[PDB]
Amino acid sequence: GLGYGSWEIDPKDLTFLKELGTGQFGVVKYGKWRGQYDVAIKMIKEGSMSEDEFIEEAKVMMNLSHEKLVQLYGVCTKQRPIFIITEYMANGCLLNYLREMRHRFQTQQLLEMCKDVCEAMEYLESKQFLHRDLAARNCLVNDQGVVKVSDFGLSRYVLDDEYTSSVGSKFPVRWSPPEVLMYSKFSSKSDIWAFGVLMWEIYSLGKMPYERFTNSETAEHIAQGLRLYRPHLASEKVYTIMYSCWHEKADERPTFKILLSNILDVMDEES
Numbered sequence: 001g002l003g004y005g006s007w008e009i010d011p012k013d014l015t016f017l018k019e020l021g022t023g024q025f026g027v028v029k030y031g032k033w034r035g036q037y038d039v040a041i042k043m044i045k046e047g048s049m050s051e052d053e054f055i056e057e058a059k060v061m062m063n064l065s066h067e068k069l070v071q072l073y074g075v076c077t078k079q080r081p082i083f084i085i086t087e088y089m090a091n092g093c094l095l096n097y098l099r100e101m102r103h104r105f106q107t108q109q110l111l112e113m114c115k116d117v118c119e120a121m122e123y124l125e126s127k128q129f130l131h132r133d134l135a136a137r138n139c140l141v142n143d144q145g146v147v148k149v150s151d152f153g154l155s156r157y158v159l160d161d162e163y164t165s166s167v168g169s170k171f172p173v174r175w176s177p178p179e180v181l182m183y184s185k186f187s188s189k190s191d192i193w194a195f196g197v198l199m200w201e202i203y204s205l206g207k208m209p210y211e212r213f214t215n216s217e218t219a220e221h222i223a224q225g226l227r228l229y230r231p232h233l234a235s236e237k238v239y240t241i242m243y244s245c246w247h248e249k250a251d252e253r254p255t256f257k258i259l260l261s262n263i264l265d266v267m268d269e270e271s
């Protein structure tokens with residue numbers, strides 16, 4: 001309507017129904033858009049986001065459409081707090097989902113979660129778009145058990161120093177390759193490394209990577225060429241795929257297109 005761009009949702013079209021929790025930008029609620037369509041609504045806490053830079057990027061992010069990406073539907077900018085409207089995922093974050101032992105997951109289900117994530121990441125890679133914080137905590141699960149990648153690229157707009165500094169308390173040390181920890185060298189290959197750690201989280205049913213180490217000790221371990229080792233539920237072929245993501249040389253790490261082909265081959269082998 002009048003006074004609203006293509007990236008703009010009228011907050012009057014929202015019905016707030018339940019609190020979902022709190023993320024880096026504050027409270028997130030479940031609601032309906034125009035009384036019918038399920039949405040998740042991020043209420044952006046004041047001082048948490050580089051809002052003007054995000055709004056300029058929101059336009060591009062809304063065009064990132066893939067069935068395995070948690071869709072950005074629009075933004076509510078003509079206010080304070082600003083809202084980010086996204087697809088709603090009924091089963092919540094993947095990390096908590098993995099930790100629920102009631103699911104009694106089969107390894108074929110765990111491989112399907114890896115494939116869902118890999119398809120989303122191949123799509124982002126095809127658009128030269130980095131996630132920047134790929135991990136099980138940044139994946140969500142829908143009512144059909146499909147895993148989708150969430151909040152891709154939003155790390156760029158976080159104003160929190162503890163999250164942005166590589167030695168910060170909230171920085172994703174355990175999902176970072178040596179070149180990020182040593183030189184701040186971010187690339188498609190740092191998303192590849194993080195994907196390998198995510199496959200390890202899936203096959204480990206949500207254990208924390210390097211669980212007996214601090215972040216400082218993890219950075220040292222990785223720098224010395226040491227790695228996570230095989231989760232009990234991962235076959236040798238699955239372990240070979242996640243391990244390939246951790247090559248010390250970033251240029252020797254696979255692309256998401258190659259990882260997708262490896263995962264499909266293993267699904268065919270372990271059918």
Ligand SMILES: Cc1c(NC(=O)c2ccc(C(C)(C)C)cc2)cccc1-c1ccnc2nc(-c3ccc(C(=O)N4CCOCC4)cc3)[nH]c12
Nearest residue numbers: 020021022023024028040088089090091092133151154155
């Ligand atoms: C995504 C999300 C965030 N994170 C963030 O905004 C956020 C922002 C920034 C970042 C960077 C920048 C660091 C990368 C990361 C992250 C925070 C809160 C809710 C949701 C959320 C969105 C979309 N859909 C969602 N669905 C949930 C849900 C929750 C609980 C149950 C629940 O209560 N259950 C009970 C029974 O067991 C499991 C489900 C069911 C469903 N939650 C959702």
